[PDB]
Amino acid sequence: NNPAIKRIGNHITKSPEDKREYRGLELANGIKVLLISDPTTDKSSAALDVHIGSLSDPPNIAGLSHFLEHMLFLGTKKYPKENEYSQFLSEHAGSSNAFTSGEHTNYYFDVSHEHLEGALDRFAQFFLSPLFDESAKDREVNAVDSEHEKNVMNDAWRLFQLEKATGNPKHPFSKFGTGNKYTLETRPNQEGIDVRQELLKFHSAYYSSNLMAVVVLGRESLDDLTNLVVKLFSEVENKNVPLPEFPEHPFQEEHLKQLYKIVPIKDIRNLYVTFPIPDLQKYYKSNPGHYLGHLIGHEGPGSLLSELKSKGWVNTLVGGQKEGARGFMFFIINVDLTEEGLLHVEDIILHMFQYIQKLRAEGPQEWVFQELKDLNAVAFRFKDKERPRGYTSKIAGILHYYPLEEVLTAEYLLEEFRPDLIEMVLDKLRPENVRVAIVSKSFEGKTDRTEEWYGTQYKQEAIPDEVIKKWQNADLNGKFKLPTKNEFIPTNFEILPLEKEATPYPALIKDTAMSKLWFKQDDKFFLPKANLNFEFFSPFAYVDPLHSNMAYLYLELLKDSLNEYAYAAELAGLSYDLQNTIYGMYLSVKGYNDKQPILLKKIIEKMATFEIDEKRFEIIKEAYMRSLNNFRAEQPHHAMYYLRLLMTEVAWTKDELKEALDDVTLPRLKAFIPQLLSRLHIEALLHGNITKQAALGIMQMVEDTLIEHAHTKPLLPSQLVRYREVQLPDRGWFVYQQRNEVHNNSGIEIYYQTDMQSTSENMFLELFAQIISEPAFNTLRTKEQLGYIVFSGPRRANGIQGLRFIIQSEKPPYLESRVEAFLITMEKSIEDMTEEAFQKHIQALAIRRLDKPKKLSAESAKYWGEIISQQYNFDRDNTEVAYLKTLTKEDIIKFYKEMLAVDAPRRHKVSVHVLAREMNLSQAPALPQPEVIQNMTEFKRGLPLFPLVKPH
Amino acid sequence: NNPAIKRIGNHITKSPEDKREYRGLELANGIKVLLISDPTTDKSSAALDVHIGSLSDPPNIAGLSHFLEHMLFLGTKKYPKENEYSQFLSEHAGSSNAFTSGEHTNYYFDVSHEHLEGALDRFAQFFLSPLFDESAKDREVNAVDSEHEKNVMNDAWRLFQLEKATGNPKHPFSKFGTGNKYTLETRPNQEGIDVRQELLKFHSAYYSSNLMAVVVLGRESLDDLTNLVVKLFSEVENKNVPLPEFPEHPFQEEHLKQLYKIVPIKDIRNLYVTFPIPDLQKYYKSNPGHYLGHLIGHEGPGSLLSELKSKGWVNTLVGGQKEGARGFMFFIINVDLTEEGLLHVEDIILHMFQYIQKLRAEGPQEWVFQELKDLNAVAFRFKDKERPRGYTSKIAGILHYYPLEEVLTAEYLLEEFRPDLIEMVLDKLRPENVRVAIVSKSFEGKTDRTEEWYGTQYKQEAIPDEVIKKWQNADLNGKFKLPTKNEFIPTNFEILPLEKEATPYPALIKDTAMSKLWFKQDDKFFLPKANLNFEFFSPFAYVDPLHSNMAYLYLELLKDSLNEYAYAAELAGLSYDLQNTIYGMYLSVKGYNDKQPILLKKIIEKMATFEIDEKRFEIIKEAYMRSLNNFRAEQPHHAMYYLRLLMTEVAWTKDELKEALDDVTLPRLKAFIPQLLSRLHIEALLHGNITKQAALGIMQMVEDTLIEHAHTKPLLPSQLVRYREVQLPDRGWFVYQQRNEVHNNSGIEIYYQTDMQSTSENMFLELFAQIISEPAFNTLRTKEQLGYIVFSGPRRANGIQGLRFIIQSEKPPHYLESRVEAFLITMEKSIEDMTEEAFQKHIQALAIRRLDKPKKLSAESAKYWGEIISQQYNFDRDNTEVAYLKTLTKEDIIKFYKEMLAVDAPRRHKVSVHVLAREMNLSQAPALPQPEVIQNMTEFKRGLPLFPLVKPH
Ligand SMILES: [Zn+2]
Ligand SMILES: [Zn+2]
């Protein structure tokens, strides 16, 4: 054996169904590596995880470890061209990205399996000699600063950082993770530090091989992927860094029995109960936290959630162990509050302790643990094949925590039942060590403290002893039961053999006035699973604001009443999704095909005979009101929204929906339901491990239940229509504008309508999109630093398509001239790019479109698309790619001069401008003055609507 | 004195609101003449009525006098061009027509006021030197045969002739009016007749001056008009023809007590009860007929219709005197029948005699006469000014019947109260001389006779003698009472003073979420009337075919419920039109403004607190079902209908409505109403003898009433959708094809769609429309004789427009197309050849047509209502558009034709609808492209862009 490989991992315990081929190993220098050999993959992929992150930033430069992560993309000693990396990845059908936690910096990529070597080499250089270019450091600090601004008004982060800022300040937990202009440029300059150096020290100090794990997946044999990793990663230095432990919990004596009152941005009510605990990671084999999470989290009859829900105090609850770092964790129970629940916080919490007391009173349930084990065992036997890129990144992450031979199984299986540990953790959940946080708009004005980084308005009190004492005496309550034995565990996993009459694509197999049924027995994956998808068209779902509203409430309340029942099902890997659409309703049922009919029958049955509950109805309606209102507080790309509204024939606005909400009275909804159901068409796609005649019987029962309980009759053919896109005039240019009252950043979509989707008109657009893709990111973000979110690519809607640009910025939408200026740069670029450059792109688009589906639901979505889009072109990718391969540099250009260029005979252009709360480089073209859109419906009315697309 | 005039008559009595000046005179040769001077009129008119008609047809050339009427239009000695007259009229903003009843032939026209003299000259010649060209006679005989085919399968015509054919056949009344090709060309050639002689002979025999009345209306002084009429009509020859009289009734004592059982074309159910009466005409000062008419026909509490409808047997009823001819008349009482009703005819007729008995038992009522007299006197005082052509035609007719001084007032005012004439006519409504027809599909198969001219299937029977007896024995039935006093009779007639800041066009005086109120106070007509129009928007009334069904049903049951109470108001000259539209509902209240808010309020209250009778729901639905179904018997030129369906964004078919009509249960309607009414928006035009504030209150009162009782609130602005027209491809051509299963002609509509309506696009279209207007009629009908129904003109929908042709024909539509297409090339050439001055004539002709001032409130209203319902709000459109029209040149129209209309126009957009018959030289046609045959209406529409909606003003 090789002098550069300290050890070899074999065998690597994997799923019984998993045809990929694993060998792990430890290099001389101390890198733990997993290699995955998949001879049939279209995309190769690799990831590296360094066991350093945010929690190790020097205290005088918050965000350094995050910022470093941003920088390693921007050029290395071997490959100085600042975007050589991300250009290579896009010229060969690939993509890359990274992230930074408290203890991890994780970097991943994928690429056309044929250029795994190129990509990997470019990538290894991040860990050998990054340039940290002085002038690139100066630009990209803004990208980070943008990232932070985006999050400043997100409530999740406000809270995330708030927790950090209310524990021990001297603890590295309290650190600002994201960093920004002040932490990373302004303050270090004033403080006399040199940032580029500190990067380099940091990199040098912590990016040591003893702290890295690498996963590399490709088509190559295990032996070849070996010499390839060894060749590339043997050189990483081993600095021998000691791996950081944080053994002292950030919440000390004084940080406990504290109540926090917090003003949100959105109109949200929320309660965050939280207890500090020791680091349960080392007991991964028995997993006590998960066991107690399973119980406290449960949503079945007898659960905490149920009682709280039944008293009208909460809607949703999550609970379980929350990750901390090596040496400290959390156990949480969060709920959202109703109006009434906000008035009864002390009570809700007493109930939380009463549940906990029940568990103590009964002690550790072995059958419950056994159940959890067997569920996991099955989950794992029949795990879906992952997308390589995510797979490598995840795995590279967990190599730090498990022996090479155990990585695949490790975060899946549970092994010994450990009652003493369940009992040591449970004993940690008590009144005298709890932290409570309430979040509500009604604390507006009553706060005294502003959190430093986000500006969060809050107040902090000691929870009075009388209240803590009252919670310790929490007795049992006969409303709390342990869960009954999960009914929906699927016993039977037979894969039925491929039928004689079986097709490669879905066949239409029932075509009645009542229902069209697309069916395909699964020919690729061979798991005991099925996907059952149904649209139920009825004009009545979206005919008008009030009706949308009701179509929505109806499904929510239905889902809500069903949730106690469906939860056990969902745990047993059999789940469903049901929502309203613009056309009437959608229902998907996915999972193990064994208990699949039972649940389906329940859902249909239940919708057709639904008793609404007044109290329930009232809570949900109010939540929904708030939810509609809270949209004023999303991000500036809002831009996307208005674009949707402007371009579609029918589209109800939030303001419209919220006007009509006041007049959904209980009777009117009751009346609404059987009306909605009286006339329908059903288009279904049933894909997976079921047979032609089994499917027929499925569809049948579905229908029959409807005919029976809701007297459904078929809909008229003419009364079945799709909606249309607005047809923009030639050489025209409109601009609509709003403000965002909440984020002090601005946003913008620019939309270049082209024509109706066809083979050719699609590929022109797709390929142009391909070519510009990364130049777009490089010019608009990397060079010009217009903001953290910059985006280009196709827009497809109602059968029409165009090109879109999205940008979020500190700048005003100006943003336009830069997008227009860029666009000319692209004109010059195509005129100069070589034939062999050009054919690289065609090949990228090619591999990308033709990449085979990995799991059954990836493939169901592919036909779903075809079916709802009413195009039915199941062989699309082959036609389209064959045609693609015919396009010359000449064609693309002509397409550009005709449709996109500043002065195209046929340029159609809309631009949405969301202005902020408060409102050298290449040359921009002079633009016409736009016709400003004063009113949205007026806009639509004075313009043609395209045709609906014909069914190939 | 004057040789040419036998006498001027005295003051001609008029309403005192009638600003027109009038002279009646009798000419030397016996022509009774009325002359109207209106120095303000935009069009002038004249009419001539000849007291001869199809009752005087030779018995062996049926229809000859109808056919003569057709032929006076095609040439006289002084003006011999086959179409000189109809062309002179087109070129000077005139129209023209004629009709032939049993005893009259009536010829009328109008023209630009400037050209009354030349119009009239051309017209007098009809009565002096008609040519009856041999080669025109040959062609036009087909126009008559078409006219008749059209009537063959229509039910009213069939019944009309069937009554004529079961009277005494030896009687003139039994004749066949229209004639056809068989009777006017075939039968006479077989029997060696020269029709041109018999036309010439009949005209010479009967168009004699002693039997003629003339009315002429122009700006000219009354003297000027006198000189004119003397000039052109003194030379009409007086043959002193005895005026024919028909003393003996055709239903003699032998054709009485008959039951007739008729198989109808449409699925209808009807009973016609009919008694013969003497001629009541001479008794016009008292009107015994109309009094019993008014009584029997009443729809108020305690009336006949009222009980009959209560026992769920009948739905509507008419009754009164039907006109006969000099010598005979009829009294009729006709009902339609419910399903139950067809099985209780015997009882229904008894109820009729019970009511008649009541009238006999009560005596005649002078207080009822008195009511009738005032309603009439009020009606005449404040009668709306009539359009000149209708007016002259009408008077010309009634000059024969009444003294000169009395023409204007004779048909209106009452004078004498005659108990004895009432008793008299009321003694003739007895079972011993009754006639009874039941029309019903349930006699299909069971009928033993065929009426020669229409083919009508029927059976005839003596009414069982003790069925008569039982009706003779009808005692009074307590559900029947004479109507009480009529509280809706207006008394306040005060024209309000013309307000301080009032305006020439409607002003938007209210702009809320619930309503847009357009208001204009009358500044032209000064009659105590007002028009109140309302659109209720609710997308709910047309969301789906089912809801449309309810929109409709609801509205009918509501109209039905009110009927008993609204009827009173209607006789009081106060009426309402209420109906469902594609955008929710339309409600109009028209007439004497005095009691109007009483009625409007009753309508809104009712329609917002409605209780639906279970019985009347089941009945009306059955009737509505039939109605839908019955469209398959509507005329082939159906074509219009399929085109409306093919080009609107949204349209439910009669077939979808028919299907979805089964799932309209009583529970389900009861739900609909409150839903529909819950969110509305109202656009209204209140117009007339009302003040700003009076108007604002009316608008508010409507709103408020709905607010109270239907908890109504504002519709969201974006839910106020207008619909769109399908946008056709450049250079495309589609054909939809269907067949009419009842009718044995075929039909066609051709649409060359052009662009959106716009000042310029509109006048380009209208100008070309006008220029081709009569050449089209002349070519496609008169020369080519493709059919009776030949129409060309503009077509306006959902803010888009274009040129259309409708024809109804014997020939197939693959042939009609080619002749229209041929006419299109004939016309580009015509435009090319015509003098600049001939071109300006047409501009002027269209210009005048557009600028014609409205004569009555309802007409000005309509023009404003068009602006509003169409959301163009171009109230001054007529000067804007005319001003612009005067700019146009031959160049512009030629370019226009070549770019939009020509057979290979770069931008021709063509739809043709071909409706085939039950059973399926000349200028050069162009060779056509290959049509795309529209297969599925919905698919066709899905695959094409839609036009924008038009910008408001
Ligand atoms: Zn980042
Ligand atoms: Zn005629």
From Swiss-Prot, chain A:
UniProt-annotated binding residues for Zn(2+): H66, H70, E147
Gene Ontology MF terms in the entry: amyloid-beta binding; ATP binding; ATP hydrolysis activity; beta-endorphin binding; endopeptidase activity; identical protein binding; insulin binding; metalloendopeptidase activity
Active site per database record: E69
Ranges that cross the membrane: none
InterPro entries: Metalloenz_LuxS/M16 (IPR011249), Pept_M16_N (IPR011765), Pept_M16_Zn_BS (IPR001431), Peptidase_M16 (IPR050626), Peptidase_M16_C (IPR007863), Peptidase_M16_M (IPR032632), PqqF-like_C_4 (IPR054734)
Pfam families named in the record: Peptidase_M16, Peptidase_M16_C, Peptidase_M16_M, PqqF-like_C_4
Gene3D superfamilies in the cross-refs: Metalloenzyme, LuxS/M16 peptidase-like
Catalytic activity: Degradation of insulin, glucagon and other polypeptides. No action on proteins
KW Coiled coil (keyword) present: no
Known partners and oligomeric status: Homodimer. Can also form homotetramers. (Microbial infection) Interacts (via N-terminus) with varicella-zoster virus (VZV) envelope glycoprotein E (via N-terminus); the membrane-associated isoform may function as an entry receptor for this virus.
Main function: Plays a role in the cellular breakdown of insulin, APP peptides, IAPP peptides, natriuretic peptides, glucagon, bradykinin, kallidin, and other peptides, and thereby plays a role in intercellular peptide signaling. Substrate binding induces important conformation changes, making it possible to bind and degrade larger substrates, such as insulin. Contributes to the regulation of peptide hormone signaling cascades and regulation of blood glucose homeostasis via its role in the degradation of insulin, glucagon and IAPP. (Microbial infection) The membrane-associated isoform acts as an entry receptor for varicella-zoster virus (VZV).
PANTHER family per record: INSULIN-DEGRADING ENZYME-RELATED, NARDILYSIN
Domain notes for this protein: The SlyX motif may be involved in the non-conventional secretion of the protein.
Protein name: Insulin-degrading enzyme
This protein's encoding gene: IDE
